[PDB]
Amino acid sequence: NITIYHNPACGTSRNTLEMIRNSGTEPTIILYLENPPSRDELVKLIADMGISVRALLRKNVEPYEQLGLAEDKFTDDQLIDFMLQHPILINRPIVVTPLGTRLCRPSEVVLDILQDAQKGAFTKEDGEKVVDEAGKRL
């Protein structure tokens, strides 16, 4: 039903996971740094997310820096294969539900693809209010 490609060390990923749970479902959790998607799966995720390959790339990580990926010298498939070989390059979290797939940056993007409403108010771990008790986005 719901899958999250999760990094426990990222607040955005933690907040997204807690919003999923606050809709009343426990997702399948894939620790993508250890169990990355296959090439076919990553291609499908990107298609369904509706963003460019480069938009999925995480900047400010060692392979991005050392491979010079900031420069516009790479095709989409070159970037995909770097993501598969260096999964820390895949930005996070990616969430799949029956409604669609999103790169949930910022975390509250996940509200778009959660079928069931938040079960009560939601406040991010840093105290940023997201939905009030009535269900309204702030």
> Which of the residues 3, 10, 14, 123 is marked catalytic?
10
Task: Choose which of 126, 133, 134, 136 interacts with Cs ion (CB under 5 A).
Answer: 126
Q: Are 29 and 74 in contact (CB under 8 A)?
A: no
Of residues 54-73, those binding Cs ion (CB under 5 A): none
Of residues 14-53, those binding Cs ion (CB under 5 A): 38
Number of residues in contact with Cs ion under rule CB under 5 A: 2
Q: How far is the CB of 76 from Cs ion (least distance, A)?
A: 20
Q: Are 14 and 8 in contact (CB under 8 A)?
A: yes
Query: Would you tell me how many other CB atoms lie within 10 Å of the CB of residue 1?
Result: 10
State both tokens at 133: 């008790």
For 102, residues 6+ apart whose C-beta sits below 8 A from its C-beta are 49, 94, 95, 109, 110, 112, 113
If the CB atoms of residues 39 and 70 are measured against Cs ion, the closer one turns out to be 39
If the CB atoms of residues 68 and 98 are measured against Cs ion, the closer one turns out to be 98
**How many whole angstroms from its chain centre is CA 76?**
19
Local structure of 88: helix, strand or coil: helix
If the CB atoms of residues 57 and 118 are measured against Cs ion, the closer one turns out to be 118
Task: Mark whether 10 is an active-site residue.
Answer: yes
Residues forming the active site: 10
Q: Which residues bind Cs ion (CB under 5 A)?
A: 38, 126
